[PDB]
Amino acid sequence: GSSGSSGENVYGYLMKYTNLVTGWQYRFFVLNNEAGLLEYFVNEQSRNQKPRGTLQLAGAVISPSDEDSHTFTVNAASGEQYKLRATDAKERQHWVSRLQICTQHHTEAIGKNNSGPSSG
């Protein structure tokens, strides 16, 4: 594989499945390498605003579909899959890969539980 020495925030407009009637709906997404949580907002103008929903990656699995050029799903250890669509066929490999690494780099990092008997 490739060691990602540097780590930058991954974000991009993806299409999330809201329902059958409506189908797909373009939306903004922002990955959190620090925390390790995948959030999403109605749009980019809703960055500082409260997020609509969050999905845990730690212990998740990425399954890139083959139906359409740009398509992929983000599973979750708990039991929740996400349906998104990359901007293009080139950006698809970016998200899938990036995430596939965030889900592991984290799930693996999670170990010794150091509550912290000392703060401030």
Side-chain angles (χ1 to χ4, degrees), residues 7-18:
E8 275 296 326
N9 36 25
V10 186
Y11 30 49
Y13 270 55
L14 305 163
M15 306 203 70
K16 198 165 152 287
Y17 209 91
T18 175

Side-chain angles (χ1 to χ4, degrees), residues 41-117:
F41 312 85
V42 175
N43 293 131
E44 206 209 32
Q45 282 194 277
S46 179
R47 270 208 205 181
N48 157 56
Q49 270 89 255
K50 187 80 88 171
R52 315 274 301 162
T54 66
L55 173 86
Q56 271 156 53
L57 290 157
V61 164
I62 294 69
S63 177
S65 301
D66 205 339
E67 284 201 26
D68 273 313
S69 310
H70 329 326
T71 321
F72 69 77
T73 49
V74 165
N75 272 272
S78 53
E80 195 163 77
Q81 178 189 73
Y82 271 40
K83 209 156 209 50
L84 319 164
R85 169 203 195 78
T87 200
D88 285 334
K90 171 279 206 80
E91 192 81 71
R92 194 274 292 171
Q93 298 201 297
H94 179 76
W95 275 108
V96 175
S97 206
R98 283 290 204 167
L99 302 150
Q100 271 208 10
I101 304 151
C102 87
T103 195
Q104 172 169 104
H105 200 62
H106 275 230
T107 205
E108 167 80 79
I110 306 151
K112 274 190 279 279
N113 270 9
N114 290 8
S115 177

